[PDB]
């Protein structure tokens, strides 16, 4: 059926939309070519609609059903708990979109009487009404990018804050625990960057002759069918659940997940969704499950040998035993026809790779570097263009989320993150004495509140001490970085080394946590390097729950 249907009304914005990168002194010392940095706005929604709207084709087969039975079997071992209104409220992000019922995020997080009563009533309605479609709002997503040799805004769809709190009560545990129990090592959100790199390399090294490929589904969300969502429910249904939870999941599937009416910010009727909503709690879990089910069966259909998959929602990467150049190519083509039949047509065409570093999954790839001793260290990196563009934008305007902080944490080992992201921002946090001001960043969809001064502990725990001593990067990584900076108008690396020397100096002067930041994060700036030893306060840090599950668009916040 059509993924979408439109009345004709337009996807509208609430407030104004900044699209051009301002001419700010602070951001300008970072990226001079400001006209190459733009932000999507509703003005291009039309273009996205035209692309995400289409008729879905799906033909299931024995392979699909065998894989589904296998997954259900594992699902059976799970026992999910219903969350208390309190627990679910504390998950609501402080800046989560307010409800159209006289209360918002803050009121929710605060167990305010009004908010709570509506939540109670919304929950009761989920238990009594098992059919009535549930309203959702549709917005043009505002994301920053660099021009190309422009991308239209993505569309987000989400129910009222009230329903969102109920989703958490009935599904937070399920989506935080089931993916793992079902997909085992193949579930990607269980791995921290280091861990993922480990899994990729060990896997690659275990194949007699490895062949790997990433597979890009053309607009995954709109490809998810009513059947996929029902099959996804059938899996949640194998869990042990409290009666009201089982009903809440049933009602939520029929009234929200499978589809429903779309309303713009003006309260007008935009159309109807019959595919995945990008802004619900089960979006990450559903997509990882759906994509895993289809890919596994497709691998069988294609006869790929001894496959090892890693799934992160719609992102998919596969490593298997090579059967030969020609064979692999045909096998990949088979795999693709299988996916197309399962309703997961390719975007870019999948290409077989025989060098791990060439494969790109989750927008990242493996690269090598050496530590103090010269030992080789695999780490995860990526073309730094988007990260940099957003760093500049986030520098010129105050934004709800700080991708830079999120990128430092996920790419702490990279050349650009250490030399650029670290220098620049610490430089600015000093000048404005906000090294202690906690900022919100995002990790796998979840919103985290973090103090920059904690970065050293965080980084050590998630990557190890080598993250502060990596050096002698591969030429390809260096060239991509250098090339990038030239393109964006960002000062060359030598200039960053100089700036870092200053930043570090000032940080050390301050002593305390700051002095540590300078000692660990910038040890690469000096030549008479210090001997970096384990940071005490690190392991004392509670990082459990940091790399357990994805929550992209799940309205999750536990910090």
Q: CA nearest 407: which of 427, 428, 422, 392?
A: 422
Run of H or E residues at 246: helix 243-252
Please tell me what DSSP assigns to residue 524. T
End-to-end Cα spacing for the chain? 40
Q: For residues 169 and 163, what is the distance between their CA atoms, to the nearest angstrom?
A: 10
Determine contact, residues 310/199, Cβ cutoff 8 Å. yes
- Size of the chain in residues: 559
Q: CA nearest 268: which of 17, 5, 7, 4?
A: 7
Q: Dihedrals φ, ψ of 338, to 5°? A: -60, -50
Task: Give bridge partners of residue 157 from the DSSP assignment.
Answer: 138
Q: For residues 49 and 51, what is the distance between their CA atoms, to the nearest angstrom?
A: 5
Q: For residues 517 and 520, what is the distance between their CA atoms, to the nearest angstrom?
A: 5
DSSP, residue by residue, 140-166? E---EEE----PPPPEEEE--HHHHHH
Task: Give bridge partners of residue 255 from the DSSP assignment.
Answer: none
Q: CA nearest 265: which of 15, 93, 43?
A: 15
Determine contact, residues 170/124, Cβ cutoff 8 Å. no
- Count other C-beta atoms under 10 Å from residue 79's C-beta: 11
- Hey, is 145 helix, strand or coil? strand
Determine contact, residues 414/463, Cβ cutoff 8 Å. no
Q: For residues 339 and 289, what is the distance between their CA atoms, to the nearest angstrom?
A: 14
Residue with tokens 């993922």: 196
371 is known to lie in a ligand binding site = no
Please tell me what DSSP assigns to residue 357. G
- Hey, is 490 helix, strand or coil? coil
Q: For residues 526 and 540, what is the distance between their CA atoms, to the nearest angstrom?
A: 29
Q: For residues 523 and 507, what is the distance between their CA atoms, to the nearest angstrom?
A: 12
Residues 6+ apart with CB under 8 A from 512: none
Q: Dihedrals φ, ψ of 177, to 5°? A: -125, -30
324: left (phi over 0), alpha (psi -120 to 50) or beta: left
Q: For residues 337 and 203, what is the distance between their CA atoms, to the nearest angstrom?
A: 25
Secondary structure in 3-state letters for 453-467 = HHHHHHHHHHHCHHH
440 is known to lie in a ligand binding site = no
Determine contact, residues 291/311, Cβ cutoff 8 Å. yes
Q: For residues 447 and 439, what is the distance between their CA atoms, to the nearest angstrom?
A: 10
Determine contact, residues 557/93, Cβ cutoff 8 Å. yes
Q: For residues 285 and 19, what is the distance between their CA atoms, to the nearest angstrom?
A: 32
Determine contact, residues 196/342, Cβ cutoff 8 Å. no
| Cα 369 → chain centroid | 25
**Tokens matching residue 299:** 């691998």
**Tokens matching residue 478:** 């260096």
Q: For residues 310 and 361, what is the distance between their CA atoms, to the nearest angstrom?
A: 9
348 is known to lie in a ligand binding site = no
Q: For residues 318 and 320, what is the distance between their CA atoms, to the nearest angstrom?
A: 7
């Amino acid at each position: 059926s059509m993924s979408y249907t439109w009345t004709g009304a337009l996807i509208t914005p609430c407030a104004a939309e900044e699209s051009k990168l301002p001419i700010n002194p602070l951001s300008n010392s970072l990226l001079r070519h400001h006209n190459m940095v733009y932000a999507t706005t509703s003005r291009s929604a039309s273009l996205r609609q035209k692309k995400v709207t289409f008729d879905r084709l799906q033909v299931l087969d024995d392979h699909y059903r065998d894989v589904l039975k296998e997954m259900k079997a594992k699902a059976s071992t799970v026992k999910a708990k219903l969350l208390s209104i309190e627990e679910a409220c504390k998950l609501t992000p402080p800046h989560s979109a307010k409800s159209k019922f006289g209360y918002g995020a803050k009121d929710v997080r605060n167990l305010s009487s009004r908010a709570v009563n509506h939540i109670r009533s919304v929950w009761e309605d989920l238990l009594e009404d098992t059919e009535t479609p549930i309203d959702t709002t549709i917005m043009a997503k505002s994301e920053v990018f660099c021009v190309q040799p422009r991308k239209p805004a993505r569309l987000i769809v989400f129910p009222d804050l009230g329903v969102r709190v109920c989703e958490k009560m009935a599904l937070y545990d399920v989506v935080s625990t089931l993916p793992q129990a079902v997909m085992g090592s193949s579930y990607g959100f269980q791995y921290s960057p280091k861990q993922r790199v480990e899994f990729l390399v060990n896997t690659w090294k275990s194949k007699k002759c490895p062949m790997g490929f990433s597979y890009d589904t053309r607009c995954f969300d709109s490809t998810v069918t009513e059947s996929d969502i029902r099959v996804e429910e059938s899996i949640y249904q194998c869990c042990d659940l409290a009666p009201e939870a089982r009903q809440a999941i049933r009602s939520l599937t029929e009234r929200l997940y499978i589809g429903g009416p779309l309303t713009n910010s003006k309260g007008q009727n935009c159309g109807y969704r019959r595919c995945r909503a990008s802004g619900v709690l089960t979006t990450s879990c559903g997509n990882t499950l759906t994509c895993y089910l289809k890919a596994t069966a497709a691998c069988r259909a294609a006869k790929l040998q001894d496959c090892t998959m890693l799934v992160n929602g719609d992102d998919l990467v596969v490593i298997c035993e090579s059967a030969g150049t020609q064979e692999d190519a045909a096998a990949l083509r088979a795999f693709t026809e299988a996916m197309t039949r399962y309703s997961a047509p390719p975007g870019d065409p999948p290409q077989p790779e025989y060098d791990l570093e060439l494969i790109t999954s989750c927008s990242s790839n493996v690269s090598v570097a050496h530590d103090a001793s010269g030992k080789r260290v695999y780490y995860l990196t990526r073309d730094p263009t988007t990260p940099l563009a957003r760093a500049a934008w986030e520098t010129a305007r105050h934004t709800p989320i700080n991708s830079w902080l999120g990128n430092i944490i996920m790419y702490a080992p990279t050349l650009w993150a250490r030399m650029i992201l670290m220098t620049h921002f610490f430089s600015i946090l000093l000048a404005q004495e906000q090294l202690e001001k906690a900022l919100d960043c995002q990790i796998y969809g979840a919103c985290y509140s973090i103090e920059p001064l904690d970065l050293p502990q965080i980084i050590e725990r998630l990557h190890g001490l080598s993250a502060f001593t990596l050096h002698s990067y591969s030429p390809g990584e260096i060239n991509r970085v250098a090339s990038c900076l030239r393109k964006l108008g960002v000062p060359p690396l030598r200039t960053w080394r100089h700036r870092a020397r200053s930043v570090r100096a000032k940080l050390l002067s301050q002593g305390g946590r700051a002095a540590t930041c300078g000692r660990y994060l910038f040890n690469w700036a000096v030549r008479t390097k210090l001997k970096l030893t384990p940071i005490p306060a690190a392991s004392q840090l509670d990082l459990s729950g940091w790399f357990v599950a994805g929550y992209s668009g799940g309205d999750i916040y536990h910090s």
